[PDB]
């Protein structure tokens, strides 16, 4: 009856009740509803064998036979392959234990079923807020022309999970964040993580420039991995660090800085050279995600946001890492009226010089 | 903040309705009666049984 068995209710209910599987509980309706789904899963598995053997026949068939050639043969197998995937999900979407295993976090993410429910959970709320953060914070069209996130990305600083688009302190955001990424797609792909600060103020040209605060690539990720620590990118996990984590900072006077954490997927069998990635940032002071993505043929999949402004701990954080620019404050540009000065008008305004000293009782000290 | 109204339904029973022909079916109603014996109905009305001569 230890903590390794669950909660107090389970540990308590597991000693006063009988040992019997949940599926074997002798309840009329529950056992009568499990018998309907029982023969259904047998009918779905019986359909996966009829559609599986139907692909072999179409696979071992000369393209000349098909009136449409090889093009009409790949569109018929495409609809069949997709029709099998839906049958594999419909064979366990009604299982009562599969729902229990996924809710308890003990579900295997290497199976289509668990990835289907895991994706239906992310879209319910988490996708909605991040889709809103992309639009409201003007990530699009600023960084990307259009972006529809496809994977979940939650970043936490020193254990504490930070919500999307939250102004964090310069001391909290001093160490590499941990990414809690969940991928809902099959296979293992290389993921590229790029943290770009899009609000660096350039006073010389009166505009903002983009500065990359972190860059990594060649990070193998499967749908079974959850946590990724940006500290050990080249020590524990495989990866190439183009630029180590730079402590976010924001000079006094300038508005809050947006730090966009982007996760981009590399195409199959495309490993970025460890020396060509550290050369891209050389002599590049306006890191453009658009151009960078187009050169390595990457695709944005996940994204998260967190802002950072001037705080009490900003000055000290710059001292440790030698970040220059601490003794620089920004003041709002003031636009004075463009109307040329004009002589004052009125009876009182005319008679305000020493000439009309006898009429100064009507002109001076007016409320 | 749109309110979620809760349904206000009265108690309902399962009633057997025996028509004038002796046939019986089950229905869901609010009345407490158990069996409703119907002496007059469409099966004993000339308008619904114009060809019947017994009722004519």
């Amino acid at each position: 009856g230890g903590p390794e068995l669950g909660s107090r209710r389970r540990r308590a209910a597991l000693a006063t009740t009988g040992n019997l599987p949940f599926e074997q509980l002798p309840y009329q309706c529950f056992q009568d509803a499990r018998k309907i789904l029982q023969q259904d899963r047998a009918a779905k598995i019986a359909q996966i064998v009829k559609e599986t053997e139907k692909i072999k026949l179409i696979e071992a068939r000369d393209a000349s036979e098909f009136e449409g050639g090889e093009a009409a043969k790949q569109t018929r197998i495409k609809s069949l392959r997709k029709y099998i995937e839906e049958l594999k999900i419909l064979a366990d979407i009604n299982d009562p234990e599969v729902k229990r295993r996924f809710e308890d976090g003990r579900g295997d993410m290497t199976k289509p079923v668990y990835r289907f429910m895991a994706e239906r959970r992310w879209r319910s709320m988490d996708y909605k807020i991040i889709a809103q953060r992309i639009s409201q914070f003007h990530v699009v069209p600023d960084l990307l022309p259009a972006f529809d996130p496809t994977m979940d990305v939650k970043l936490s600083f020193r254990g504490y999970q930070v919500s999307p688009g939250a102004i964090l302190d310069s001391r909290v955001t001093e160490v590499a964040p941990t990414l809690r990424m969940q991928v809902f797609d099959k296979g293992e792909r290389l993921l590229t993580v790029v943290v770009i600060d899009s609000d660096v103020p350039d006073v010389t040209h009166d505009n903002f420039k983009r500065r990359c605060h972190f860059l990594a690539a060649n990070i193998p990720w499967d749908p079974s991995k959850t946590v990724l620590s940006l500290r050990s990118v080249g020590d524990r996990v495989e990866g190439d660090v183009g630029k180590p984590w730079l402590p976010p900072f924001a000079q006094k006077g300038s508005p809050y800085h947006r730090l966009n954490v982007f996760v981009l997927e590399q195409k199959p069998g495309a490993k970025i050279d460890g020396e060509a990635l550290k050369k891209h940032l050389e002599n590049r002071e306006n890191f453009s995600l658009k151009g960078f993505r187009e050169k390595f043929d990457l695709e944005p999949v996940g994204f998260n946001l967190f802002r950072s402004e001037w705080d009490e701990g900003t000055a000290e954080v710059m001292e440790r890492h030698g970040i220059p620019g601490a003794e620089v404050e920004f003041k709002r540009q003031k636009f004075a009226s463009l109307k040329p000065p004009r002589k004052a008008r009125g009876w009182e305004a005319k008679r305000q010089k020493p000439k009309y000293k006898s009429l100064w009782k009507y002109v001076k000290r007016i409320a | 903040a749109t309110f979620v109204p809760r349904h206000r339904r009265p108690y309902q029973f399962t009633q057997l309705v025996q028509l004038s022909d002796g046939s019986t079916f089950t229905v869901r109603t609010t009345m407490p009666t158990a069996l409703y014996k119907s002496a007059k109905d469409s099966r004993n009305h000339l308008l619904w049984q114009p060809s019947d001569k017994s009722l004519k």
């Binding site: 309840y27 309907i36 259904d40 009562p96 | 009265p10 022909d21 002796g22």
Partner: protein, 123 residues
Amino acid sequence: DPRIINILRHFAVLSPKRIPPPLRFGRNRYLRHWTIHRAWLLFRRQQREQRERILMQQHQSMSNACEELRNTEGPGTRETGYLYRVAMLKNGVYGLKSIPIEYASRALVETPGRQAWNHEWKR
């Protein structure tokens, strides 16, 4: 007045504060209800797909016969498709006496009556 109070007492019970509260199920009960819910919806699908399959088959049979009937000729010196054009007429279909009241009024019943069928009916 006393009879009216009896009426009010009925509404007072249906007040939002008096009616029962929303159900509160545990996990095991909730999961069991989920299976009962899941199966019932699937069971409707099977009844729906079955009911819709029969409706489709019947329509195909009508279309086959009608399409074939349109190509035939006769009887005798009658132009091709005369019978097809006559069958499509809807004279009285939407009238008052379209469908006999007796046939429609009779419905399915859980148990039969004293006389299930009347064979003594005379024209």
